[PDB]
């Protein structure tokens, strides 16, 4: 992957006005994130969860299902954020499986690149890797895979930087 700064005028998840976007963001990220989305408030259906993850439980399936079946959403954005307390090198004992399992697996699978980086740059890399893995795994959900095969769904990854108030798309 590479990071591409977004231009707010032409975001990949808004090539046409009027349609609703499922925005999947993190519980410890603020509203300030959506100011970098390129979407007006009335085009946003917002799921906000631990580490902007979708794990295969009833909440992920029901939210995906309602978004596709009732709102006929054609775009999903997974928005990670720099400074995230959940997608970081600090392993918090209060964080349950499978959220903790996803993060352990990322740390082991990407050990080579992560091992060469100090704390702040390591945590930024882990936010980005978490967004990529969430985008890849949501594409393999049964409901998303059938929509993608009809070219009736796109899933996008982005990272928001609180400090610069800018978003970066994962390409």
Binding positions for Zn(2+): 26, 28, 31, 46, 81, 84
Q: Choose which of 3, 44, 125, 148 interacts with its own copies (CB under 8 A).
A: 44
CB of 1 to its own copies, least distance (A): 27
Closest C-alpha to 121, from 91, 88, 92, 99: 88
CA–CA distance, 74 with 147 (Å, rounded to integer): 9
Residues 48-87 touching Zn ion, rule: CB under 5 A, are: 84, 86
Tokens at 7, concatenated: 């231009």
Strands 166-170 and 154-161: antiparallel
Tokens at 23, concatenated: 């925005």
Torsion sign over Cα 37, 57, 66, 138: positive
Residues 11-40 touching its own copies, rule: CB under 8 A, are: 27-28, 30-32, 34
Is 65 a binding residue for its own copies by CB under 8 A? The answer is: yes
* Site of interaction with its own copies (CB under 8 A): 27-28, 30-32, 34, 41-42, 44-50, 55, 57-63, 65-66, 68-71, 86, 92-96, 98-99
């Amino acid at each position: 992957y590479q990071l591409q700064p977004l231009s707010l005028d032409s975001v990949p998840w808004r090539r046409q006005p009027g349609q609703q976007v499922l925005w999947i963001g993190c519980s410890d990220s603020g509203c300030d994130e959506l100011e970098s989305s390129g979407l007006p408030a009335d085009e946003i259906f917002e799921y906000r969860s631990l580490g902007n993850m979708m794990v295969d439980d009833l909440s992920c399936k029901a939210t995906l299902g309602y978004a596709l079946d009732s709102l006929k959403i054609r775009n999903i954005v997974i928005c990670g954020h720099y400074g995230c307390h959940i997608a970081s090198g600090e392993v918090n004992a209060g964080l349950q499986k499978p959220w903790s399992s996803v993060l352990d697996t990322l740390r082991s699978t990407h050990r080579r690149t992560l091992d060469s980086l100090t704390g702040t740059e390591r945590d930024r890399a882990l936010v980005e890797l978490n967004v990529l893995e969430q985008v890849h795994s949501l594409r393999q959900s049964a409901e998303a895979a059938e929509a993608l095969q009809k070219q009736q769904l796109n899933i996008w990854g982005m990272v928001y930087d609180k400090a610069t108030k800018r978003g970066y798309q994962l390409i």
